Design a protein around this ligand. Sequence first.
Ligand code: CLA
Ligand code: CLA
Ligand code: CLA
Ligand code: CLA
Ligand code: CLA
Ligand code: CLA
Ligand code: A86
Ligand code: DD6
Ligand code: BCR
Ligand code: BCR
Ligand code: SF4
Lengths: 49, 80, 122, 167, 731, 185, 36
Amino acid sequence: GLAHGYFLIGPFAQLGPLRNSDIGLLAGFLSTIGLILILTLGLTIYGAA
Amino acid sequence: SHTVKIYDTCIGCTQCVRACPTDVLEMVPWDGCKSGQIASSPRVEDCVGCKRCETACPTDFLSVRVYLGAETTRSLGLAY
Amino acid sequence: VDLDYGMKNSYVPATGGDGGQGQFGAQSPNDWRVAGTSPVGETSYAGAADGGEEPWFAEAISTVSLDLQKADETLKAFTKDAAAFKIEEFADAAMEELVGKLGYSKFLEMSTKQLMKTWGTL
Amino acid sequence: EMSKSIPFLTVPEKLDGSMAGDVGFDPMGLSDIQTDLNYARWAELKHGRICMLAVVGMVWQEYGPHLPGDAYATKDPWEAISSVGFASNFQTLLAIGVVELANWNKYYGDGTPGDIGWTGGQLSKMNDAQIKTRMESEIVHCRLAMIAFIGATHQTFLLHKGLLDFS
Amino acid sequence: ATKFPKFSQALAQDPATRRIWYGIATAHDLEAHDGMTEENLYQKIFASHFGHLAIIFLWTSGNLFHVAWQGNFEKWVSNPLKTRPIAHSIWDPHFGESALKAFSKGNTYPVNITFSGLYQWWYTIGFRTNQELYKGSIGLLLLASVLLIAGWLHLQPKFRPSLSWFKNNESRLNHHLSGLLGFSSLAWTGHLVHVAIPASRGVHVGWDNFLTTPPHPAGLTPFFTGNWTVYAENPDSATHVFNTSEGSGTAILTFLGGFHPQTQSLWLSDMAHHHLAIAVVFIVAGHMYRTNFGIGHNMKEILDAHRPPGGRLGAGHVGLFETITNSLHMQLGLALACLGVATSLTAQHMYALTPYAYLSKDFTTEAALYTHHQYIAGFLMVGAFAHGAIFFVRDYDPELNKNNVLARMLEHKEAIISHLSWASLFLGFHTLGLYIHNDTVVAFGQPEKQILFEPLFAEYIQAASGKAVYQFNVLLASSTSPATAAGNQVWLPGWLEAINNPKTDLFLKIGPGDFLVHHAIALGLHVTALILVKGALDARGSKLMPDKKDFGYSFPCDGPGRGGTCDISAWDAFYLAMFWMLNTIGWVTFYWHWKHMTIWGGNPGQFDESSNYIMGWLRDYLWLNSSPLINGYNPFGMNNLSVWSWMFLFGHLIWATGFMFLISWRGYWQELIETLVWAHERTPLANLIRWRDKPVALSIVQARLVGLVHFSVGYILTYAAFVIASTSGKF
Amino acid sequence: SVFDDAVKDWAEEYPQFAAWGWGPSVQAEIWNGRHAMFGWVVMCACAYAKGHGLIPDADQTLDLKEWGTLATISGKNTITNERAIILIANVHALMVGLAATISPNSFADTLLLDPNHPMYEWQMERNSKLGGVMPNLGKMGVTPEAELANGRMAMMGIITCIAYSGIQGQSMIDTINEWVGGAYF
Amino acid sequence: MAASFLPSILVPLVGLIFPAFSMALFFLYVQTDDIA
Ligand code: CLA
Ligand code: CLA
Ligand code: CLA
Ligand code: CLA
Ligand code: CLA
Ligand code: CLA
Ligand SMILES: CC(=O)O[C@H]1CC(C)(C)C(=C=C/C(C)=C/C=C/C(C)=C/C=C/C=C(C)/C=C/C=C(\C)C(=O)C[C@@]23O[C@]2(C)C[C@@H](O)CC3(C)C)[C@](C)(O)C1
Ligand SMILES: CC1=C(C#C/C(C)=C/C=C/C(C)=C/C=C/C=C(C)/C=C/C=C(C)/C=C/[C@@]23O[C@]2(C)C[C@@H](O)CC3(C)C)C(C)(C)C[C@H](O)C1
Ligand SMILES: CC1=C(/C=C/C(C)=C/C=C/C(C)=C/C=C/C=C(C)/C=C/C=C(C)/C=C/C2=C(C)CCCC2(C)C)C(C)(C)CCC1
Ligand SMILES: CC1=C(/C=C/C(C)=C/C=C/C(C)=C/C=C/C=C(C)/C=C/C=C(C)/C=C/C2=C(C)CCCC2(C)C)C(C)(C)CCC1
Ligand code: SF4
């Protein structure tokens, strides 16, 4: 998780819809957290199966 | 597993047995035809359903019939 | 060695459109759905090979082999009924004469009259 | 044999006379399709009890002391629904729903139809003859009240007279 | 039955991804499920029907709620011709600021404009306010809950109906004719007289006041005295302003004919009288069959009695009663066939005999409604034939039907199929030849050499109904005809005013282009029928596969032997006929749309001249009318049609993607997936994860179905985008 | 009672969910009561901060060019600063809750009854002990019984606050203020 | 609280949360080895 979350924020921060706003970094972090939640759901249901 | 049936129009030509790629069929003694043998399918668990046996059968209509059914690893021809 | 080991699987044949388990069984008795690779020092499943310092290729290590003795013995075990039939039609000691004189595979391959001919020699 | 209420018809087989209030009245044969009459009797008792309370309420809210309050003052039962407000009708609906859903397994059950437990200790010192008499009386009151409610309603929206205004 | 799907042991034991796909695709084929009995089959179908009706009522309640909550129905009512009716609000975080502004034109917030005709229909039936619509929505929501409860209840052990109840033909037919149709029609007449007609005359009649507001000043005295003409006296005048009292009459039942002069739609009194006569006819019809009261017909006796004495029909209709009763597939086929006819009739009659106020002025809505109903009719007809074929495979018993009409169809299937093929070939050869001849002569700059047959028979039919343009003095176009003298007594004046009014769609003027396009439509109908009929009639077997019935309705093929047997099953005939149904309905809707676009554009002559060759269709219909659609967004900006531009491209993409499944077949994909499996098993850090369902290529039949679904969805979405965008961006 | 029959029938109708503690379970009652208590804290804080105007530019709306279309309510009309701020505070709490749900420690009271977690047996024992109409006045202080009782009280208070605010035709903040004797506004 | 807020509240629940949980539930159901 430490390895992946660090680089995942970059695409969102630098290329997301709000990249040119002054809250672009915060939006990138929020997008990264959302992606991590999606991946964690994947891991959870994978383990269950 | 697929179903393979032999009907009594079989003339014991052994062509379906030679055509089978997975050795499902074999010739067995029988007094119903001149050749003195009939086809048999004792190993339908290995039948892939290619229908080469039906392509090989000379009777009209076919004497060997393959009905496709429940798929397994063996019937799907999977190497994995 | 049990002969119905293949048949003793969990495959329950359906009531229609299903040839069932034939001469050896419709499927393996072993559940193929096992875990993926595992860290150094751990096994993914019960009989898995320890990939040593390369567990990521652990599945490329073979734990299933066929040694020639097992091959001969299972050849004899699986064809015991066919040999019993051939001696029943040709006619204990006589079978031991035939299968050592010419061979076991040859004894299966020959015919009852032909074996009646080779039994002429002693 | 023949029906008691309609003497020229054959009784349907389900009306064996066991249930209270049975006089072999089912000319349309509605009981023939049902598996048993338990749900039908639950429904008959529930409808009749509600109609009894509804008729009593129609009379009281027309010639009786209302609870103090501006909203609760109108003597017109149809207008009462709007006058008291959603906030009271909804509480009534929710409490009734709680009682209904708590007794769900009795309504779709195999016990005696109508008996949700609220007995008042009335049927403790009775045999089966007296319990049967009580059940017959309750079912007859239910059946009278349903007709009465139909009458009362059709006299308050088709003529707009009162219930006790016989002019 | 231990894994999904629990209804199929054979599928549940498959170790491949196939197990999932097939489970989903076989969930509603309840007859094939393991351990199914007939009684359980009927009970499960009954419950599923309750669920489906709940879904329908939820959909209707939602339309009502979204219009009430977010629509402009009151503004539309106050000003029908200058308002665009709203379907629902947009909330889409992906929108840019430009998109929000573009989609909020004429409003304060982004909206989709409805093209379903709901506003016109609700306006015609007496809806005037958002509160009334909301009350309707609430009622339908509660009704959906009631239907769900009923579905649950009729699955409980004490409430499951028996098989005898499901097989009671006479009673079900009596109730569905007299009650479901006849009494529903009577109640609808009651609504029209009490609610809709007063609303059209500027009078509010609602739940608040309907018990004390008689729909006619004379009350019910004329009805009970037999002096019924009183209900026809004093209709709305020719100057009647709809929704207001000016020029209004008091007639509640009329036979005026034609259209209301201002709405250009049917008189509400005429529709009320229509539903009253319909109610009488259906209530009477619902008393034909014997239920419990000694009187009435038995259907089996009726069927068994109808055998021609000469014998040209053999055993006649004996055996058909049991065949129909015991076969859900034949019943479903009959239902789908009649529904398809009725849906096509809906499409054909709604455009010509406009039933709803101001609907003929909402051009995009007209086009959308016609296209929608015609495509649904096509789907229903295809379904009818598919279920006929399924009946032949699964339910037909040769001994029960011995020598009856159903068996004799099978007996002369070769003649039937060969003659249908001849008709198809004749129509195709000559229609395509005439189109090509016209194309060629016009290309060489000699349009006077075109072959232009006048649709004389259809023009004669129009004249017979009263159209005067074609100079045929026949029947209703003839002053001295008996038909004219008779009809002038009731409905003929209004009908003649409408039919000879070129501003209406009542019997549009036709010419040679109509002739050629109609023969193209006949080609489509005949070829679609040929495919479906050959599939049904060869479903049980053919010379190439004499035992086809042993293999079921759907199966991939019988292998490469005997010359090759791809697409031999009856399901494959359904699959092939879906393409022809789509092509045919496309020709139909293209014809409708182009003729109406040229009429609405004020230049019918463009259709009349350019429809006689294919290049005219390509250039003056598709190319010319693509313009607003393809400019919904461009390098300079976007407008509210951009969603349709995107959907247009979306449909093209889906259609083309369907081509991949239709053209490339299974072996290639299975071999590719083998290398994919190899790659995943050999990749470190990814081989920590493994599938529990072995990846396999899609099956032969599954790929045909997936290709067909992609093709059909792309076809539908592309055309819907085109028709909506072209009509709405032009007018 | 009706309670035991109700829970048993619900479990029989939804066994897969009833396995994890979903539905009308003691586990769900405990967790929802904990949330209701914390939410009473948050609602009181919101009422107090609205009464004293401690939220900056509460009635001002968020900039569309700053936060984009996600901040819109209808068209280009954006959410207010106060609503966004309240949402963010609750989002802090929700992120805590997601961390607790997804990565519980070994001695933690997990959200769901996981047989593989080291607290499963303790959880089942505790949940079997709790139950009844009146709170156990024998057990007080920091105990599961007191926690359950106070969670029940908080959920009841939420229901009554919603209902009272509805009847009086006023906002929930107004009810909260008028229930503390107008201590906020 | 107002109904005008409902889209921005409900749309993410219908279009993101609900499909994700429904797909996870269906995945778990199809991977279950003993369903009955
Ligand atoms: C497939 C091609 C493609 C690409 C490159 C993009 C790119 C983009 N899209 Mg678009 N988009 C696409 C197709 C694509 N889109 C499609 C098909 C649709 C649907 C019609 C959309 C609809 C859409 C919308 C609605 C939006 C975007 C947006 C964006 C931007 C932000 C996306 C983001 O942050 O993802 C995050 C990316 C990641 C989390 C990971 C990226 C992949 C990594 C970098 C690969 C690394 C591999 C590595 C090198 C391997 C070895 C490493 C080592 C260990 C050896 C970005 C420029 C957003 C925008 O605002 O645009 C300006 C936006 O709002 N897109
Ligand atoms: C009179 C009492 C009555 C009524 C109102 C109904 C009503 C219904 N029953 Mg029936 N049913 C009855 C008695 C009744 N039933 C009896 C006595 C039995 C036992 C014998 C049954 C046994 C039964 C079964 C087994 C089923 C039903 C079903 C239904 C539903 C059919 C689907 C639907 O909703 O379409 C309603 C449609 C309309 C109101 C409009 C119909 C218009 C169509 C398109 C015909 C239009 C033709 C047009 C008028 C003229 C011809 C066109 C021409 C000019 C070209 C409907 C609610 C089905 C269901 O879904 O239940 C859940 C079902 O499966 N019923
Ligand atoms: C074919 C018959 C028919 C149809 C389709 C309609 C349709 C309509 N009528 Mg009309 N009407 C009819 C016959 C019909 N009517 C007849 C015979 C009369 C008497 C002459 C009327 C008199 C009339 C009046 C006075 C009014 C209407 C109105 C309407 C419209 C709104 C109705 C509504 O609120 O829907 C919602 C559905 C319902 C109200 C009925 C279903 C109610 C459900 C089943 C309640 C559930 C009950 C259950 C106990 C709930 C609890 C249990 C559950 C939660 C589990 C709608 C277009 C209204 C309108 O707005 O016109 C423009 C209106 O004011 N109609
Ligand atoms: C009253 C209407 C009705 C009813 C009750 C039935 C009932 C049945 N049909 Mg029939 N059928 C109908 C109409 C009907 N059909 C119509 C209109 C057609 C013409 C298309 C057919 C053609 C047909 C064929 C060819 C077959 C059936 C079969 C069946 C049986 C199995 C159904 C099944 O399991 O598939 C369930 C299907 C699904 C669960 C998925 C459906 C796939 C949908 C369409 C995909 C949705 C499109 C996509 C999501 C949109 C993309 C959106 C885009 C914007 C991205 C069942 C008895 C089968 C059978 O064998 O019967 C014995 C069969 O082979 N039907
Ligand atoms: C536009 C493309 C197209 C065309 C022209 C056809 C044409 C035909 N289809 Mg086909 N079909 C198509 C697409 C097409 N289909 C698609 C996409 C599918 C889905 C797979 C099908 C599936 C299908 C089925 C299931 C059936 C047909 C049938 C037919 C025939 C129908 C009867 C007819 O009109 O005869 C008239 C003939 C024509 C219109 C074609 C001839 C074209 C010109 C006029 C001939 C010129 C010859 C030229 C001078 C010689 C060559 C010059 C040089 C190379 C030497 C007709 C040949 C049916 C059939 O066989 O009926 C008898 C049939 O059952 N089609
Ligand atoms: C079945 C018809 C139907 C359809 C297709 C829609 C579609 C929509 N609704 Mg609406 N809704 C409906 C009925 C419907 N609604 C009804 C009857 C009500 C009154 C309770 C509402 C109350 C409502 C509100 C308050 C809002 C929407 C909104 C929306 C939009 C976004 C989805 C959403 O978040 O809603 C959430 C929906 C609900 C919370 C209740 C849904 C109730 C319906 C009956 C569910 C239907 C189930 C369906 C029939 C299952 C079959 C489909 C499946 C087989 C594919 C979308 C256009 C949002 C919007 O307008 O954004 C701009 C929005 O804020 N709807
Ligand atoms: C929890 C628990 O255990 O506690 C126990 C305690 C206890 C007490 C033991 C219990 C009990 C028993 C109960 C509740 C008994 C209530 C009984 C009741 C209230 C029974 C009559 C109804 C009305 C009738 C018959 C009207 C006929 C009406 C007729 C014939 C009319 O003509 C009506 C009329 O309108 C028209 C039609 C025409 C109009 O012109 C005018 C009039 C007005 C004339 C319970 C349930 O067990 C609970
Ligand atoms: C008796 C029984 C019957 C029953 C019943 C009846 C009426 C049952 C009653 C059920 C009803 C009464 C149950 C309400 C609970 C209150 C909820 C959980 C409160 C959540 C409050 C918490 C989750 C939320 C808190 C927040 O929101 C706040 C506060 C502020 C925010 O900043 C922060 C947070 C997000 C934390 C049956 C079943 C019908 C049939 C059976 O046979 C017999
Ligand atoms: C295969 C199959 C099937 C199916 C079928 C189908 C699908 C069909 C269709 C069919 C159709 C779809 C038909 C149609 C028909 C129609 C018609 C028959 C019509 C007629 C009309 C008329 C008669 C009219 C007349 C008139 C009038 C009235 C007025 C004036 C004008 C005129 C003259 C026109 C089934 C299921 C059965 C079963 C078996 C198999
Ligand atoms: C987290 C936290 C905390 C905790 C808290 C808590 C613990 C809470 C609790 C809370 C609670 C615990 C709440 C409650 C509430 C309640 C209420 C609000 C109630 C109300 C109710 C009512 C209103 C009632 C009514 C009634 C009834 C129902 C019946 C009888 C009658 C009467 C009328 C009485 C603290 C602060 C420490 C610290 C910080 C953080
Ligand atoms: S089944 Fe056909 S091919 Fe095989 S032996 Fe008999 S006749 Fe020959």
